[PDB]
Amino acid sequence: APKAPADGLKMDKTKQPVVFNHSTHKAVKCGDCHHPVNGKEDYQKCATAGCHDNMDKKDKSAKGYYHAMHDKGTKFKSCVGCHLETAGADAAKKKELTGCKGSKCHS
Ligand code: HEM
Ligand code: HEM
Ligand code: HEM
Ligand code: HEM
């Protein structure tokens, strides 16, 4: 099975780039993020053609890149979706982990 890459990975499909560190997400199963497609876990970049390649941040289809990173009620938990649950009622953690600005995701 594929190995986790180094920390400091930059997601930069957009003008609001975010750094992702695998080391802080070890408690999450690889396949929770690199989820099954056609029955097999897919480790291709999220925005690969035919995947989440729609850079229209309003799109909520299975192709919406912004959607897969931010929204709730999705088949696999998104960045913000999981972080919301992690922060719970903790407003400082809400700011750190789900804030739209001044957070660990967006400066
Ligand atoms: C868990 C053990 C685990 C593995 C294995 C793994 C692998 C992996 C690879 C090989 C990449 C590089 C992709 C490329 O070709 O550039 C990669 C990238 C990302 N990962 Fe990962 N990963 C594992 C676990 C997790 C977990 C727990 C999450 C989510 C909570 C996660 C997320 C990401 C993200 C985001 C990327 C960047 C991909 C992009 O298109 O920007 N990984 N991982
Ligand atoms: C890469 C790390 C990556 C992320 C992040 C990601 C997330 C994601 C979410 C949050 C959903 C749910 C959306 C919803 O509204 O329910 C979701 C769904 C699908 N994805 Fe994905 N995904 C990542 C990677 C990839 C790759 C590499 C592809 C294409 C090969 C891909 C495709 C899809 C498709 C299609 C779905 C729907 C699957 C289903 O069972 O309905 N994703 N993704
Ligand atoms: C999805 C692409 C995604 C991003 C981006 C992301 C980022 C992120 C950061 C920047 C941190 C803080 C630590 C660091 O700098 O590495 C952080 C921390 C936690 N996360 Fe996350 N994260 C994304 C996705 C997910 C998903 C899908 C989950 C859970 C299913 C998850 C969980 C966590 C947890 C737990 C932490 C640590 C909590 C803390 O208080 O530090 N993330 N993430
Ligand atoms: C909070 C509600 C919040 C907002 C709003 C927000 C906005 C935002 C924008 C405008 C983009 C760029 C979209 C485009 O295509 O122009 C963007 C991109 C990413 N985000 Fe975000 N964002 C909010 C919060 C968070 C949080 C808390 C995280 C991480 C846990 C996060 C992550 C990401 C990721 C990943 C991207 C894509 C980065 C890239 O590929 O360039 N956002 N966000």
UniProtKB/Swiss-Prot annotation:
GO cellular component, as recorded: periplasmic space
Keyword DNA-binding: no
Listed name of the protein: Cytochrome c3
Modification(s) after translation: Binds 4 heme c groups per subunit.
Binding site for heme c 2: 35, 46, 51-52
Binding site for heme c 1: 22, 30, 33-34
Localisation per UniProt entry: Periplasm
Range of the intact protein held here: 24 to 130 of 130
Residues engaged in binding heme c 4: 70, 100, 105-106
Keywords (A to Z) from UniProt: Electron transport, Heme, Iron, Metal-binding, Periplasm, Signal, Sulfate respiration, Transport
Organism: Nitratidesulfovibrio vulgaris (strain DSM 19637 / Miyazaki F)
One GO biological process term: anaerobic respiration
Binding residues for heme c 3: 25, 79, 82-83
Gene Ontology molecular function: electron transfer activity; heme binding; metal ion binding
Recorded superkingdom: Bacteria
Annotated function: Participates in sulfate respiration coupled with phosphorylation by transferring electrons from the enzyme dehydrogenase to ferredoxin.
Main location: periplasm
Further comment found in the protein's record: The second and fourth heme binding sites have unusual CXXXXCH motifs.
